[PDB]
Amino acid sequence: KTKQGVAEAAGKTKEGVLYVGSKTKEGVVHGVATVAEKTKEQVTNVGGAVVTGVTAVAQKTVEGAGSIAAATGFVKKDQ
């Protein structure tokens, strides 16, 4: 047997109130807040990559090798 990333909860009672709960989070992006007020942005681009936004990426994979989650704002000119 093998357990990985497992949340387990067990409870037992006779009389009263019983609460049992389990939660799991794998590859989760939570709570991203961004505010821009009275911001001046001037961009001149000639054949390049410019990124000034908000990016939130969450990736979960099983048995995956060589995977890329996020590749933002790049110039790739391989031969």
Place this chain on the structure above:
Amino acid sequence: KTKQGVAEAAGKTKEGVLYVGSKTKEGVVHGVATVAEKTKEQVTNVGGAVVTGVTAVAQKTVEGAGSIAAATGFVKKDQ
């Protein structure tokens, strides 16, 4: 047997209130806040990569070798 990243909770009672809970977080990005007020930005790009934004990347993988989570703002010209 083998346990890795396992959250376990157990409780037992006879009379009263019982609370049992378990939580797990693997590859989680939480609580990213960014504020830009009265900011002046001037960018001139010629064939390059410029990144001035907000990036939040969370990646969880199993049996994955050579994986890249985030690659932001790069110039790659391999031969």
Place this chain on the structure above:
Amino acid sequence: KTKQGVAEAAGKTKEGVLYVGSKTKEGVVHGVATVAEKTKEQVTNVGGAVVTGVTAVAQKTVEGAGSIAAATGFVKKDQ
């Protein structure tokens, strides 16, 4: 048997209130705050990489060798 990164909690009572909880955090980025007020930025880029933003990367992997979590703002020209 083998335990790694395991959170365990156990409780027992007869009468009253019992609280049992377990939490686990692996590869977690939490609480990133950034403020820019009245900031002047001037960037001139010619074939390079410039990064002036906010980057938050969290990566969790199992059985993964040679993995890179974050590679930000680089110029790579391998032959």
Place this chain on the structure above:
Amino acid sequence: KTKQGVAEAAGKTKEGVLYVGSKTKEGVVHGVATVAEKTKEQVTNVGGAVVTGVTAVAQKTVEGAGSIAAATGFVKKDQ
């Protein structure tokens, strides 16, 4: 048997209030705050790498050799 990075808690009572909790943190970046006020930045880049932002990287890996968590602001020209 072998235990590594294990948080364990056990409690027992008959009458009253019992609280049992366990927490684990592995590869966690917590509480990063950055403020820039009335800051002037002028950057001229020609084929290089310039990084003036905020970077927070957390990586947790098992059975991974040769892994790099963060590689920020570099020029690599291997032959």
Place this chain on the structure above:
Amino acid sequence: KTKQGVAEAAGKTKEGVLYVGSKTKEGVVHGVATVAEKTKEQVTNVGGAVVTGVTAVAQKTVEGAGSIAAATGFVKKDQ
């Protein structure tokens, strides 16, 4: 048996209030604060690496040899 980086707590009582807790921190970066006020920065880069930002890296690995956590602001031209 072998224990490494293990936090253990045990408590027993009959009547009253009992609190049992255990915490573990491995490869954790906590509480990084940076303030720049009225700062003037002028950078001219020609084929080099310049890093003037805030970097927080936390890496936890098991059975990993030759791993690098952070490599910031370098020029590598190996033959």
Place this chain on the structure above:
Amino acid sequence: GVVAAAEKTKQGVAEAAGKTKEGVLYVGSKTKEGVVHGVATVAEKTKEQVTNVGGAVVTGVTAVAQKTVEGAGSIAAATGFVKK
């Protein structure tokens, strides 16, 4: 007077404002005003006798959460002769 001008450009923005008053903004925030969370009570054999004559009595297991803006929040108020 407030004047903003932009002449002979390719892309131009000219904004002029006399008086400006900003307001409140909440982006990805959580608020808790007057919140009761997680109350557990266990009673086995409780004996209670109450004799109330012209008054306010609050007994037992009571959980009250109140949020008042332009008024008063009371649990037990035994008053008299409230005028105007």
Place this chain on the structure above:
Amino acid sequence: GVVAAAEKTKQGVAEAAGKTKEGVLYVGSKTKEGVVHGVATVAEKTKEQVTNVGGAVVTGVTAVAQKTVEGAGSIAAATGFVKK
């Protein structure tokens, strides 16, 4: 007077403001005002006798959370002759 000008450019922004008053902004924040959290009480054999004559009595297991802006927050108030 407040004047902002930008002449003979490719990209130009000209902003002029006479008076500016900023406000409150909450980005990714949490607030707790008047919050009761995590109360546990165990009672086995409790004897309680209350004799109230023209008053405010609050007994038992009581958990109160109050948030008042322009008023008063009271738990037990035995007053008299409140005017204007």
Place this chain on the structure above:
Amino acid sequence: GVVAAAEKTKQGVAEAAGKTKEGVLYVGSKTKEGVVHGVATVAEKTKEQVTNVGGAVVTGVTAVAQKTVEGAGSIAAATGFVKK
């Protein structure tokens, strides 16, 4: 007078402000005002006798959290003749 000018540029920003008053900003912060957290009480055999005549009495296991802005926060107030 306040003047800001930018002439003969490729990218130019000209901003002029007469008077500026900044406000409060909370980015990734937590606040706790009037918070009761983690109260545990165990009572086995409690004997309580209360005789109240024209007053405010608060007994038992009491947990109160109050947050008042423009008012008074009281637990037990036995007053009289409150005017204007």
Place this chain on the structure above:
Amino acid sequence: GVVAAAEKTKQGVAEAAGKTKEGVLYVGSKTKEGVVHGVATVAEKTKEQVTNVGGAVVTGVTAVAQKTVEGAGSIAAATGFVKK
């Protein structure tokens, strides 16, 4: 007068401000004002007798957290003849 100018540049910023008043900013901070944390009480056999005549009495296990801005925070106040 306040003057800011930038002439004959490639990238230029000209900002002029007459009067500036900064405010409060909290980035990744925690605050605790009027907070009760971690109170444990164990009572086995408690005998309590209270005789209240025109007064404020607070007994038992009491945990109070108060945060008042423009008012008074009281636990037990037995006053009289409060005017204006």
Place this chain on the structure above:
Amino acid sequence: GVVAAAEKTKQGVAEAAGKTKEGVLYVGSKTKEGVVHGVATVAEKTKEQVTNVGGAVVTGVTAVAQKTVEGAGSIAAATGFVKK
């Protein structure tokens, strides 16, 4: 007068400010004002008798945390004839 100029550059910033008043900023800080932390009380056999006539009495296990800005914080106040 306050003058800032930048002529014949490639990248230039010219900022001029007449009067500036900075404010408070908290970056990654923790504050504790009026905080009660870690109180443990054990009582086995307690005998208490209270006879209150026109006064404020506070007994038992009491934990109070108060934070007042523009007011008074009192635990027990037995006053009279409070005017204006």
